[PDB]
Amino acid sequence: ALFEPTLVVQALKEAVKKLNPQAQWRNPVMFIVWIGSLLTTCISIAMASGAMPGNALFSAAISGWLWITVLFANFAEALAEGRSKAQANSLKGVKKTAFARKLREPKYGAAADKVPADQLRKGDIVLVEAGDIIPCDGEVIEGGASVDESAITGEAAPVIRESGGDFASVTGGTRILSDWLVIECSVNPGETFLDRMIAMVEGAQRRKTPNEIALTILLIALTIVFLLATATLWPFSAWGGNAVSVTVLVALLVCLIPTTIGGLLSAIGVAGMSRMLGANVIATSGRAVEAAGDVDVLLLDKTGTITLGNRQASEFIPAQGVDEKTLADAAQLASLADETPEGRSIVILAKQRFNLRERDVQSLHATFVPFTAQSRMSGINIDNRMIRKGSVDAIRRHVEANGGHFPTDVDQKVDQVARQGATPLVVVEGSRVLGVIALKDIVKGGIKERFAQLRKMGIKTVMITGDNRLTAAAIAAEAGVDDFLAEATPEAKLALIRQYQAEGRLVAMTGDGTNDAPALAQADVAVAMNSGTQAAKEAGNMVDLDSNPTKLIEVVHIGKQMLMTRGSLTTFSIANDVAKYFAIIPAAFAATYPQLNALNIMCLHSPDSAILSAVIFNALIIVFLIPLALKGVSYKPLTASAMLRRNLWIYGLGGLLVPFIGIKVIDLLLTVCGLV
Amino acid sequence: MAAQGFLLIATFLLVLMVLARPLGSGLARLINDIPLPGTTGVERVLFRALGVSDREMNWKQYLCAILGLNMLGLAVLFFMLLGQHYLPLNPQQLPGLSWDLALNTAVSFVTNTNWQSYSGETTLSYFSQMAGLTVQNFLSAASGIAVIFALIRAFTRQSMSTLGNAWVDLLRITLWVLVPVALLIALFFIQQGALQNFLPYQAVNTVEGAQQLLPMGPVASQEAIKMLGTNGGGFFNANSSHPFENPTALTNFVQMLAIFLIPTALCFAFGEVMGDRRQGRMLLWAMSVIFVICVGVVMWAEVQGNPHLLALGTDSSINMEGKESRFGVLVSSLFAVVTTAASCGAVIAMHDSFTALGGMVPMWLMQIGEVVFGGVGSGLYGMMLFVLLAVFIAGLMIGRTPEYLGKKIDVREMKLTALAILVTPTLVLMGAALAMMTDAGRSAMLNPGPHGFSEVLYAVSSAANNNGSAFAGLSANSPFWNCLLAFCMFVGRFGVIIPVMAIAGSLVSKKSQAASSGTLPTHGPLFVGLLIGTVLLVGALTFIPALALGPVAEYLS
């Protein structure tokens, strides 16, 4: 994203001063500086009016520099909000054209009529052809074509979204290329995740993260310390001689209180949310994002999340007591009416290998047994005697129910297929078994390097798969993950998230299926896959758009950069105050305490120049740390102690030496310009 | 001279750790609700007689128990000191106190501050200085140890919403940790030449012939708990400078050891209770570095001394004004830093005749919140508050959730930790402002110039930080000063006590997390430096203005 376009800066410069009239009630640290600014302005007006004799130009300059310090803080906040608004305007979309075709019959029964999409309720089916933008979120029940997710995700790439299986989700705002699709209105418009992310940033509903409330409490406490010190400084000098003025006390108080972090904290939060969305991952609440920095385990699905999905068969295998046409005739009707990718793959491969033109969909009817992820079973029964298919455990336990004895040579064959790296699939001939169907799966690229980076950072990636034990080993050897949980019922992950949560650890995962929705809803940091069901979309607190299974490294980059930048600005604002003392305390007591001039270690020109230079640096450090708050401080995967040491060396002694040089430079510039 | 001072620091710290190593295991046994190697049914029959059981109550009832015991003690002290002449054992027939003096001294001895606005030998009787002084010193020390015991129990207990029993805690602490060690210390004081009797004031004719009245009374029994429990306030006005209180350098060294015994043993008990001793030694390093730095700075300042003395025909420029002669200037500097850092009101020197910088450093150690080997438990929970701030800042720096010893620090812990941090400096600053805006407050002044404001600020800091050591030039016997100091001490100690108990009750509701890879190590030189810098900056950004108007102004004048 462009950091500072001149047009948007001059557009939000009015919004900078729109938040000036008493809109800082929710910001106590800057309400203090606003009260001080008003008090200094009032005493400067009454001081130039004749009463309270003194040099009113110095008080007027002090009041102006506090006022533009307030303006700089509001400029940081408004610049972060303007960047978020520009991102929301970029993610508005194309869907303002509400030309949707109302469909009556739940099939391709024509019914093309232009109706507005504002009355689209839950339970209404919409069919549109290629070349037209889809109105809302779509869960295709039948069909499948190529879509363009450029305007929603960010990149244009030919992707095929079929129906039936897990990859049956399309988001509104994506053009269609080849064939018609079926849109199912699962959610009302204005309540989808896209509408939520483009509407939350519009309103000022910023539910602060508990770390942000805690640091706000700490900054308020610091403000109380400095306010009491400033207030009690007056009677001490009053007893000591001529009391210090109100304006020098207000300037010292403003230079003392954490103005930097106290004005850049909201900018840090909003710009961090903008950078979060800039990685094509959406977070509806920062409370999970701030806790995402403290994660140690990542749970990953395999079928459809790590791999590309669409399991295509490669070669059939026979057994000792079976022929090949007996494989083919059962295989072509095992999942003939199913829209499963494995079923369509075995159908097309059987037809390519033998061209058995049997019944097209059924003879007269069938059972059409659905595929449940817990039992891993499917079958069709019309003319044979209960022929089915499923995973290795399901087929074995069906053999114990039907045949009893199982072929150990076929067991060796499925073991060698698993070592080869194909997901097993065994069908039933009715009483015995015929062999396995090898499904050579294809895996996404770069995941090995990204998991190596995750291991360098220290997140223990765990594979969650219910296919086979040796298949998990074969898929782990070429991906580089930790120990897996293979042959697992989908309730095992639901038990395991609570097991890791009850140990004190914070668990994070990803998923796309409807069966995974309780795990997405119960996990702490649960990103939702873009090619996933709306149940998973609403269950997960975050949603991905790049269709990447390991965007959690970018998630923890954003969260750790948030916490790092906020704490670093806090420590910088703490370290500024000793140089603020060395600039103001010798300056504040000159006539009443002439012996305090020996503490001018910077050798400044005049006390008024010293106080003015301190206030100028108080404004200038904020306006110079606006880009740091926008970008986020640099984060590298290292030891926690080493990272603490590096942050200390940068924002400790470094943030202590910066105010000295800044105050000296500003005082020298004031001296050479000759104002004071 | 510098080698002698460094040797003094080294041998004092060495014998301190030597004597604190066996006490750490015992205090850990007391924390873990484990009975002593003795206690052969005496605890059972005593609790049956006193009507207490081995119960397990929450933080609200623990805090209510401590507050009720302290309030009952305060009421008893106030009535006893008001009606002093009615009670027996008054050989000098000293009359009853004023209402303001009695209230100030009662709050002074119950709230562990032990500010003394009077002269003891012509102010209070023998039974008064026994019952209303030593008993409440024992009770205040036991209350501090019980509160820090509850805090350590809260840190070490997982999913247990109850924090032991304050009655059994106070009983076991008072009658197994404070009393026998005080008996040994008082017997050593009697061996070295302290005072313990009940004879009237012995009339003494001098060698030349002038009259002299020597005060008597139970001084050693006061001194023993007075140094063991970090409870200031002597039998006489010269608090631990009277030769009837401090006869020898061995007595003074044992007094130093008794002052630093309990905070070091509490740090060792933290290390032993929490399994690993690295977390109990990080705290000790954090105390020891600042302690060595402050002691060395004060020794250097006192060795350089006053140039006016050398200008006025004196061979030694060392400022020995207002100092003992049996006790060296290095020993006086070390004892001054020890008492001003450990909330003990003992004054080897009058603290007012010091150099400006050598009074600036101990008053700064007063004003940082009394953490560096501070108080009796009162310094260790303040150090715990600073550790919570340090781990919050460190978790912010590393990007992880702010946690300490497996317990995640939450918004309630931050709220109560901030409140407990803010209770002391708001009282110091507001009391100083109220004292310097009134002619009654400023009419107690003795030294003209910025040292007078240094005296007032030291008085209010020693009050609200519960230390009790004074420059003694302030005429704090006025009713306004007495009421202001008594209010500051009372609300300071108990408004730090209440949020500490609230943090303990917020931490018992949570559960510990096992340490894994990538976590923050909460020991080592990096975390020690971070904690020391946090404490130094919090104590400096609050008080550099007041220090600059006081002793720094006097030094630069």
């Binding site: 106590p28 602060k208 308020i220 109380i224 306010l227 207030a231 109100v246 | 918004v411």
Partner: peptide, 27 residues
Amino acid sequence: MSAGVITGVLLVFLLLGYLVYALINAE
């Protein structure tokens, strides 16, 4: 001790009360 002094003390107490209220109710 004067009108300006008591006005400044009142303003400081108002700011202190507001900051304490914000610390209690940072929400």
